[PDB]
Amino acid sequence: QVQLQESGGGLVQPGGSLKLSCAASGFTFSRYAMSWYRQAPGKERESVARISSGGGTIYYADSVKGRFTISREDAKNTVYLQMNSLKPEDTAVYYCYVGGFWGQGTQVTVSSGG
């Protein structure tokens, strides 16, 4: 019973920060690379970040390099995505992913409102 439960999304202004969490269960978490993807309205799903088993090898999409940080805490079976200096084009549903399994998604909206 693989479960990927995400949280930490929200509604923030440009320049803001959020930290997404994906709490995993039902498989041997430490053995697998974990990924974050996003799907923005009217766009196709995009890989955002990936962290290897062991946490040593990390991938970022060029558009989030230097602003986003992916990490994992194997003792909590959780992978995280710290997002900073958020931009409107970062608006999307964000998904946790591993081995053909997807989380349910967490909404991230970046808007000044005004």
**Residues 111, 33: Cα–Cα separation, whole Å:** 32
Token reading at 35: 């990924």
DSSP string over 6-51: EE--EEE-TT--EEEEEEEESS-GGGS-EEEEEE-TTS--EEEEEE
For Cα atoms 52, 58, 64, give the angle at the middle one, nearest 5 degrees: 135
**Residues 67, 94: Cα–Cα separation, whole Å:** 16
**Residues 14, 25: Cα–Cα separation, whole Å:** 33
**Residues 64, 33: Cα–Cα separation, whole Å:** 19
* Pair 74, 12: CB distance under 8 Å: no
Resolution (A): 1.9
Residues facing residue 6 across a β-bridge: 22
Residues facing residue 36 across a β-bridge: 49, 96
Domain boundaries, the chain: 1-114
The architecture that CATH gives domain 1-114 is Sandwich (2.60)
Q: For the chain, first and last CA: distance in Å?
A: 44
**Residues 71, 2: Cα–Cα separation, whole Å:** 20
**Residues 56, 102: Cα–Cα separation, whole Å:** 23
Give just the sign of the alpha carbon dihedral 90, 93, 98, 99: negative
